[PDB]
Amino acid sequence: MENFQKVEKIGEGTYGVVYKARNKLTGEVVALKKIVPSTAIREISLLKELNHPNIVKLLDVIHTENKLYLVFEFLHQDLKKFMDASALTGIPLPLIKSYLFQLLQGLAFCHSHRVLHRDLKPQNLLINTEGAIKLADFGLARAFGVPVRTYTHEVVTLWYRAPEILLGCKYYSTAVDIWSLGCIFAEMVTRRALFPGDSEIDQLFRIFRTLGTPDEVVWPGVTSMPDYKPSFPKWARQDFSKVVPPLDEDGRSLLSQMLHYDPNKRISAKAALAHPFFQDVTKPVPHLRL
Ligand SMILES: Nc1ncnc2c1ncn2[C@@H]1O[C@H](COP(=O)(O)OP(=O)(O)OP(=O)(O)O)[C@@H](O)[C@H]1O
Ligand SMILES: [Mg+2]
Known part of the structure; x- marks a missing residue:
């Protein structure tokens, strides 16, 4: 999750805190949610295949140190x-x-x-x-x-x-x-x-x-x-x-x-x-x- 620079705290909510952030490789601008249960990992992972133009795309799931990070497409x-x-x-x-x-x-x-x-x-x-x-x-x-x-x-x-x-x-x-x-x-x-x-x-x-x-x-x-x-x-x-x-x-x-x-x-x-x-x-x- 060190592969991202945090630009600004978009908000906080039920599951965790959402930051606007930038990929240090790509330059891609993303929404990074910081939220681990195995059942929760497999289910989150099949959501990655649920793509549709009116669904905010789940770019990636970064599970590290008992910490879970969901990287989504960003919208203004x-x-x-x-x-x-x-x-x-x-x-x-x-x-x-x-x-x-x-x-x-x-x-x-x-x-x-x-x-x-x-x-x-x-x-x-x-x-x-x-x-x-x-x-x-x-x-x-x-x-x-x-x-x-x-x-x-x-x-x-x-x-x-x-x-x-x-x-x-x-x-x-x-x-x-x-x-x-x-x-x-x-x-x-x-x-x-x-x-x-x-x-x-x-x-x-x-x-x-x-x-x-x-x-x-x-x-x-x-x-x-x-x-x-x-x-x-x-x-x-x-x-x-x-x-x-x-x-x-x-x-x-x-x-x-x-x-x-x-x-x-x-x-x-x-x-x-x-x-x-x-x-x-x-x-x-x-x-x-x-
Ligand atoms: N993909 C995203 N792109 C841009 N801004 C986002 C994105 N996802 C979330 N935000 C905004 O960040 C803020 C926090 O979202 P968050 O999921 O934490 O809370 P919520 O939508 O209010 O409640 P809930 O936890 O049930 O989702 C909200 O204003 C949300 O609209
Ligand atoms: Mg939300």
């Missing part, structure tokens, strides 16, 4: 910062659209190989100057664990967590990433998080107050999930037209099928790509200050 900005920069104005719809479409291609790819992200959030979505958006940190949650408290005391977000994970479903599927990207999609449109919980019960209860408390009608098997409680308050669903207002009906219709309560009814990434909302999809360039 994440979606959280692009969003904070665009607050006043909002992200134009055609770019939101391009972004959702490309993230769906990324998910269709990984899901077809049976790999889930499990932790999608605006900081894990990286963008460049040509209009591309890529998923970062795919596969890592299953390969190492997803802690309560991110490494540097920071608390991983729950705002994007699917309801079956919150209800203690042990074997959740690729549908959990479609739930999370739906919540991001909504947030790009409105400029405000859809479900900002600050705890697991608050998270749940914020989902219940917009989409209605789920029951055996909308979701067969829900009432015998491990953290389901018959004492949960019964709240009615609200309409999407109030939820993500500006969005047109193709957009709300796609969003509502991404937010289905039952993960077997939730749209897959491959069906979502054929949805009529994407009929006029283009690829615009964003306005970016590096």
Whole structure:
């Protein structure tokens, strides 16, 4: 790991600390994550073969001295910062659209190989100057664990967590990433998080107050999930037209099928790509200050 000069601490997070760095041989500019379990080594290593244009490439895995270093392709900005920069104005719809479409291609790819992200959030979505958006940190949650408290005391977000994970479903599927990207999609449109919980019960209860408390009608098997409680308050669903207002009906219709309560009814990434909302999809360039 001495083959890299550290330029700047990009950030810290669940697994470790990310630095911008330079290859002392190549001159290649990379993101170097400093995170070892053998199971975790083999799984990280098969992720190296998961290449796709909307997936941040894992250049190399440097395992030395009980220390693990993940060297990724570097991108100049994440979606959280692009969003904070665009607050006043909002992200134009055609770019939101391009972004959702490309993230769906990324998910269709990984899901077809049976790999889930499990932790999608605006900081894990990286963008460049040509209009591309890529998923970062795919596969890592299953390969190492997803802690309560991110490494540097920071608390991983729950705002994007699917309801079956919150209800203690042990074997959740690729549908959990479609739930999370739906919540991001909504947030790009409105400029405000859809479900900002600050705890697991608050998270749940914020989902219940917009989409209605789920029951055996909308979701067969829900009432015998491990953290389901018959004492949960019964709240009615609200309409999407109030939820993500500006969005047109193709957009709300796609969003509502991404937010289905039952993960077997939730749209897959491959069906979502054929949805009529994407009929006029283009690829615009964003306005970016590096
Ligand atoms: N490949 C990369 N290129 C450029 N910047 C990156 C890259 N990967 C990560 N960063 C940015 O570095 C910061 C730290 O990323 P990090 O993975 O540690 O945290 P996170 O995405 O916020 O949470 P999590 O640990 O769950 O991934 C975030 O701002 C991330 O967007
Ligand atoms: Mg990350």
